[PDB]
């Protein structure tokens, strides 16, 4: 839940406004003053995937992914950039490959034989982690991630011969990918083209010949190995040498685009008639993801320069820049319509036409799986520890959570919201303000739980636009990188549904020599503007991507957004080296169901280990967090209390008979759909076993005092409908899904509406 006043966009949300992206902190942004027509038909979207555990120890090299490890190690690792990293990799690669000894000394170790041939039978086995231990001393580095890449190289040429133990295994987690390129994500993905051409040379060494000459002859010296490695590692050193600075490949090729978009480009520097006609610029001219990248470029550098020869050289840059991105990468070009598919919109209309509130939401497919691991140290004061997945705890919850899944789907939240604004609104126009725009982004709040951050700094990042410094850099680096996704994800949306876009050039405050911002042509067919613009001509031209949303008609999301859980189960043996205590929630719970029977109070305590079938309380196990599940429920809570608040706010000032009865018509109808939902959770596997026990602690507490039995014609039912409801919270409480505070207010809402009173009123006949 994030609310903004679309009339004053500057103040309410500056993160999503365009005025911020191109460097206007001050309120002013130019009108539709000067313009050039354009159509964006393509975009660069990250492939749809989220982090997965990948294991580095085994002999294979999968160049695409090791590349991905560099992204994470350097970028999110706190280091400067993957660019500086890769450079320090090829100084490292030059060190070993071009050096004749370092390939002898560690083939003396693995083969055992310094000066003489080794037979075919007498071939020992040396575990992979071994040779790594020594290579550390030979070719020392400050980045362990290099030693792993060389280690499993020699493992690859020696694997057929069998000089090494297969059994050992080891594991890391690759990171999540931003869906749209930040400026630097271009620079990175260009260097990562070098790197991928590096590794594809190492990876592809068969050494079949060395396998043939070993078999027939029966023996070979280290002089055959230690050359045949040194031939491989210097084939890779070729392929690294002589590639262009990514930093100056892109910096230019985003400028010479930026000059053929902007209408005002001085003729003194005009991209020439040849490069405008270059093969491929045509396509890159119409591409969006670059544009919002360009806007970033100038936001930071403030300027641009073309170092490369304006003609002869810059026409071999582009065909090299295209081949970098176009090739399979995290970023793959797609028709623009598709990348926004999951966003959806709905609005609350006045009688005339214009919006009162208008909601924008990300659809979701609720994640119905959950896993629970127990961490196991290798030795005292060693951080290697590797977890054991425990089934039978997890089978419970995932068969418990699967019933929850069906009933919370996001579309049913907004389908509910607009049903509120129908009832609460008066009959009269809204001139008073632009229609406020509420936007659910469960992805925002989601990222706060896995990163463990106060939801208030995340929101307040979008509002004011600046990130708080008080937090440590690991968060801000994933915060800003996030806050840029939403910005981008907005404009892909706005553009997708208003194909007419027009590129101006901002120069009012003369902040930068080159600047760009779109302005949309949307045809409103409305009388009065929301936001502020002159609404002249039967179409409005609005620089802000948000306003240009508001004038859309309802849109139904065509594609469910997909969360997917991190997978521990597959590799059990491999030792986890990534910290897993960030993604782990402790699992413990206590609660008491209190009821009053014939003027006394009977309280049944209950513990979580009982609920699960465990007989004893085991401390170690830790539930791996259900973020996306806690994301949605968090949304659905805040929109529920928000609704139920706004009504009881109108319900006081209604001053009508016909309308007032329509509010209480709504609340009651709301709260007993609330409850029939929670009662539906009570029948679940944890819900069951919570009930069966709670009644049983209450019985044996009444043993001492003989008192008369109930009718249970409806009493069994009345008591039953109550005990289930308390199961409904207990299951939500014990998993992370609902915090204890909001669980209380959610009782209080269901409490005063006397929902339960009305639920039973359908089970009697009069």
């Amino acid at each position: 839940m994030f609310n903004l006043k679309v009339k004053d966009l500057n103040g309410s949300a500056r993160g999503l406004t365009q005025a911020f992206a191109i460097g206007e902190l001050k309120n002013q942004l130019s009108v539709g003053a000067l313009q050039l027509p354009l159509q964006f038909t393509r975009t660069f979207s990250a492939s749809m995937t989220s982090e997965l555990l990948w294991e580095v120890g085994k002999g294979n090299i999968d160049p695409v992914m090791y590349a991905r490890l560099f992204f994470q190690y350097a970028q999110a690792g706190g280091a400067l950039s993957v660019d500086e990293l890769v450079n320090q990799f090829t100084e490292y690669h030059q060190s070993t490959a071009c050096n004749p000894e370092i390939w002898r000394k560690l083939t003396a170790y693995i083969t055992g034989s310094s000066n003489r041939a080794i037979k075919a039978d007498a071939v020992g086995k040396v575990p992979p982690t071994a040779i790594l231990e020594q290579l550390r001393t030979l070719a020392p580095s400050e980045h362990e991630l290099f030693h792993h890449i060389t280690t499993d190289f020699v493992c690859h040429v020696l694997s057929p011969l069998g000089f090494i133990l297969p059994d050992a295994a080891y594991v890391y987690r690759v990171g999540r990918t931003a869906t749209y390129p930040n400026f630097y994500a271009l620079v990175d993905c260009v260097r990562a083209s070098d790197l991928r051409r590096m590794l594809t040379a190492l990876s592809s060494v068969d050494s079949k010949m060395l396998q043939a000459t070993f078999k027939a002859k029966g023996a070979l010296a280290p002089a055959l190995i230690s050359q045949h490695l040194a031939n491989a590692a210097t084939t890779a050193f070729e392929r690294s040498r002589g590639n262009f600075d990514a930093n100056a490949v892109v910096s230019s090729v985003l400028t010479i685009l930026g000059r053929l978009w902007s209408p005002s480009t001085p003729k003194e520097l005009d991209p020439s008639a040849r490069l405008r006609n270059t093969n491929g610029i045509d396509q890159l001219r119409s591409n969006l993801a670059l544009f919002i990248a360009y806007q970033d470029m100038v936001k930071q550098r403030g300027r641009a320069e073309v170092i490369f020869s304006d003609e002869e050289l810059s026409s071999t840059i582009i065909p090299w820049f295209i081949e970098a991105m176009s090739e399979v990468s995290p970023f793959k070009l797609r028709p623009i319509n598709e990348t926004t598919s999951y966003i959806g919109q709905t609005s609350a209309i006045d009688h005339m036409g214009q919006p009162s509130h208008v909601v924008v939401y990300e659809d979701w497919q609720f994640a119905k799986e959950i896993t629970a691991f127990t961490p196991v140290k290798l030795a005292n004061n060693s951080n290697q520890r590797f977890l054991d997945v425990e089934p039978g705890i997890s089978d419970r919850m995932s068969a418990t959570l699967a019933p929850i899944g069906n009933t919370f789907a996001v579309s049913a939240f907004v389908k509910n919201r607009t049903a509120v604004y129908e009832a609460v609104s008066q009959r009269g126009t809204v001139n008073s303000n632009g229609a406020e725009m509420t936007l659910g982004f469960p992805s925002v709040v989601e990222r706060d739980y896995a990163l463990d951050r106060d939801p208030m700094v995340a929101i307040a990042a979008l509002r004011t636009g600046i990130v708080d410094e008080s937090l440590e850099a690991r968060a801000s680096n994933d915060l800003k990188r996030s806050m840029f996704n939403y910005y981008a994800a907005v404009m892909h949306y706005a553009v997708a549904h208003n194909p007419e876009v027009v590129v101006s050039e901002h120069q009012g405050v003369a902040a930068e020599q080159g600047s760009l911002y779109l302005v949309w042509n949307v045809r409103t067919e409305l009388r009065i503007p929301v936001g502020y613009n002159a609404i002249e001509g039967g179409s409005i031209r609005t620089p802000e991507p948000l306003e240009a949303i508001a004038y859309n008609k309802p849109i139904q999301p065509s594609e469910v957004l997909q969360a997917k859980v991190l997978d521990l189960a597959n590799h059990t043996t491999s030792i986890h080296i990534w910290p897993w205590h960030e993604a782990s929630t402790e699992f413990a719970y206590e609660d008491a169901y209190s009821v009053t029977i014939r003027n006394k109070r009977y309280t049944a305590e209950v513990k979580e280990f009982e609920l699960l079938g465990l007989g004893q309380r085991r401390e170690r196990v830790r539930i791996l967090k259900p973020t996306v599940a806690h994301a949605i429920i968090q949304m659905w809570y805040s929109w529920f209390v928000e609704d139920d608040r706004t009504l009881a706010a109108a319900r006081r000032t209604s001053r009508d008979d016909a309308e007032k009865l329509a509010i209480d018509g709504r609340r009651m109808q709301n709260a007993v759909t609330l409850l029939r939902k929670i009662e539906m959770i009570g029948t679940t596997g944890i819900g069951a076993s919570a009930v069966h026990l709670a009644q049983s602690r209450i019985v044996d507490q009444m043993a001492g005092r003989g008192l008369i039995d109930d009718s249970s014609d409806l009493h069994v039912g009345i008591n039953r409908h109550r005990i289930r409801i308390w199961a409904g919270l207990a299951v939500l409480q014990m998993m992370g899904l609902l915090s204890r505070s909001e669980a209380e207010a959610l009782t209080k809402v269901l409490g005063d509406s006397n929902a339960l009173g009305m639920v039973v009123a359908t089970t009697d006949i009069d």
Binding site: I466, V467, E469, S741
Partner: protein, 148 residues
Amino acid sequence: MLLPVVARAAVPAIESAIAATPGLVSRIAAAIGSKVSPSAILAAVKSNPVVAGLTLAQIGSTGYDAYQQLLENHPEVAEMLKDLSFKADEIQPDFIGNLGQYREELELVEDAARFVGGMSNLIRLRQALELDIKYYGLKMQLNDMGYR
């Protein structure tokens, strides 16, 4: 360099402090490590935000205002500013042992907390009980009138 918005307000604040007393001029010259001449440091302030911050730490009297506003102007200097400016807080000899006695006590509160709810609730509930008796009577009476 230095952004102009910071400059219109920031430059005169320092200059004022300099004109107030010379004794500060020598101090800032030592901390920032700049030429002792008042014209020199004023040339440095404009050049780097990080430098501008350390100066405003040296003079807190008149200068505190701009300093906070500088936080807004540059995220980076403040981020690398918190580290460069630091002083070890003198610890009292008794303190750590004196804290050892409250181990028994705080664990008692947190037993009471969990029961009631968030700490905020318990602070309320504590007052409700400590509250005068008449109030319980008052509330009962409003319910007697059919108000609730």
